[PDB]
Amino acid sequence: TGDERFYAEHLMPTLQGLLDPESAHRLAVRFTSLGLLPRARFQDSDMLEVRVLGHKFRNPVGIAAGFDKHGEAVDGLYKMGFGFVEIGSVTPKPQEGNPRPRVFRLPEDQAVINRYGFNSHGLSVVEHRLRARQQKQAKLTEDGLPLGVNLGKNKTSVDAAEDYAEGVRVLGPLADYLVVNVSSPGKAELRRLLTKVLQERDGLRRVHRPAVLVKIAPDLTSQDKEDIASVVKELGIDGLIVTNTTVSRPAGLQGALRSETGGLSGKPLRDLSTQTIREMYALTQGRVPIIGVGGVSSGQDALEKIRAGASLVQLYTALTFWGPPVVGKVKRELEALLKEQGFGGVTDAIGADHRR
Numbered sequence: 117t118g119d120e121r122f123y124a125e126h127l128m129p130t131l132q133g134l135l136d137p138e139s140a141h142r143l144a145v146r147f148t149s150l151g152l153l154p155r156a157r158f159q160d161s162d163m164l165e166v167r168v169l170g171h172k173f174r175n176p177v178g179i180a181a182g183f184d185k186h187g188e189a190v191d192g193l194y195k196m197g198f199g200f201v202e203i204g205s206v207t208p209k210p211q212e213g214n215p216r217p218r219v220f221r222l223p224e225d226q227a228v229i230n231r232y233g234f235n236s237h238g239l240s241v242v243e244h245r246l247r248a249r250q251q252k253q254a255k256l257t258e259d260g261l262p263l264g265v266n267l268g269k270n271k272t273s274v275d276a277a278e279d280y281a282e283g284v285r286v287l288g289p290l291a292d293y294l295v296v297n298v299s300s301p302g303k304a305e306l307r308r309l310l311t312k313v314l315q316e317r318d319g320l321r322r323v324h325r326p327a328v329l330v331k332i333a334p335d336l337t338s339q340d341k342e343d344i345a346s347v348v349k350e351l352g353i354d355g356l357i358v359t360n361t362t363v364s365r366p367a368g369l370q371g372a373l374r375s376e377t378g379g380l381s382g383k384p385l386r387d388l389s390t391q392t393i394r395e396m397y398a399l400t401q402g403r404v405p406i407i408g409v410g411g412v413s414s415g416q417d418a419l420e421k422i423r424a425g426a427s428l429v430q431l432y433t434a435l436t437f438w439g440p441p442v443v444g445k446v447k448r449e450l451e452a453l454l455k456e457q458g459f460g461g462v463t464d465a466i467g468a469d470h471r472r
């Protein structure tokens with residue numbers, strides 16, 4: 117498209133050249149929230165529809181947590197063409213997060229490093245924001261555009277389980293799915309924590325009862341992954357989000373800011389994330405839905421995660437470089453690749469590498 121090339125080659129580089137990454141983030145949220153966006157003319161085909169987590173998703177490409185931390189831009193993100201929106205992380209009480217600067221761009225690597233530290237308006241502010249559009253969301257969800265809420269914990273919390281429990285009670289009734297991050301940059305403690313989360317979820321009225329997913333880092337040992345898969349199956353967790361940012365620094369990063377503290381996102385995370393999907397799919401015998409995330413910026417990227425075991429994918433970093441046209445780009449390329457490889461639709465491709 118003309119927009120894709122123009123955004124990617126001219127507009128987005130100029131905007132990034134003018135604005136530090138955090139300022140750029142804020143501007144993007146503000147523009148999205150006001151619907152000041154190019155016209156998303158890609159109409160989603162039936163091939164892209166997925167049914168998972170008790171919901172219909174008109175397409176499998178979502179916005180990852182962190183872009184819209186406080187639930188300010190949900191409708192604009194649907195307008196951009198995302199098949200689903202995840203907001204958060206939201207903490208129980210408002211908190212400022214880490215001192216600035218805390219977001220860094222690695223243009224040479226198509227990567228970002230962030231150490232925001234869960235800057236959050238808090239549950240109560242986000243609750244009121246979602247309540248203001250609750251019925252609009254119900255219609256969107258019914259039309260195949262679900263909403264996820266990522267729950268965090270406060271810096272000073274003396275018991276993580278209570279922070280997450282509070283999030284379930286307050287935002288669970290407003291979400292199609294909730295996410296508990298065991299990922300932000302004993303199995304018995306994870307079992308305790310997730311048991312408490314599921315109990316709180318099960319205590320919500322049936323029309324207000326969300327799916328619960330666990331979001332993991334790519335930095336886990338083999339033992340950690342085995343332990344997570346075991347607990348997820350034992351307790352009946354509804355899904356996994358794979359992955360958060362990495363605290364590793366893969367060999368070959370060129371950006372001047374590569375040694376900044378924080379989570380690395382984007383292209384250097386891509387295959388690490390895909391491999392983690394592949395492993396978690398196998399450890400859960402393909403019975404636990406996975407949302408695949410990390411360094412997706414093309415149809416090929418999306419399909420590699422789907423074939424590795426993802427039912428859905430998310431992106432964030434690619435949006436910062438390519439702008440809004442990236443969403444339609446990924447969807448269109450994914451559709452073409454599905455046809456080329458002989459799949460009837462996304463559904464047929466989920467986990468296809470494991471049947472090879």
Ligand SMILES: Cc1cc2nc3c(=O)[nH]c(=O)nc-3n(C[C@H](O)[C@H](O)[C@H](O)COP(=O)(O)O)c2cc1C
Pocket residue numbers: 180181182183185204205219228230232234266297331359360361381382383385409410411412430431432433434
């Ligand atoms: C600036 C920034 C902030 C993020 N904040 C959050 C967050 O609050 N909660 C969360 O679960 N993930 C957070 N993430 C991680 C993303 O949701 C995603 O897992 C990761 O960036 C990999 O996807 P990407 O390579 O497409 O960006 C953040 C990522 C970035 C770049």
Ligand SMILES: CN(c1ccccc1)c1ccc2c(c1)CCC[C@H]2CNc1cnccc1C(=O)O
Pocket residue numbers: 127131132135136137138140141143144145147148152153154219220221228435436437439440
């Ligand atoms: C929504 N949108 C839009 C683009 C054109 C026209 C109308 C809308 C849009 C989407 C994305 C963006 C911008 C604008 C403007 C700043 C650039 C990026 C955001 N950048 C970051 C975000 N989080 C973290 C880091 C960065 C970064 O730059 O390092």
Ligand SMILES: O=C(O)c1cc(=O)[nH]c(=O)[nH]1
Pocket residue numbers: 182205230231232233234235297299300301360361379
């Ligand atoms: O808020 C943050 O700093 C944060 C949380 C998280 O899960 N991932 C990330 O990259 N940043």
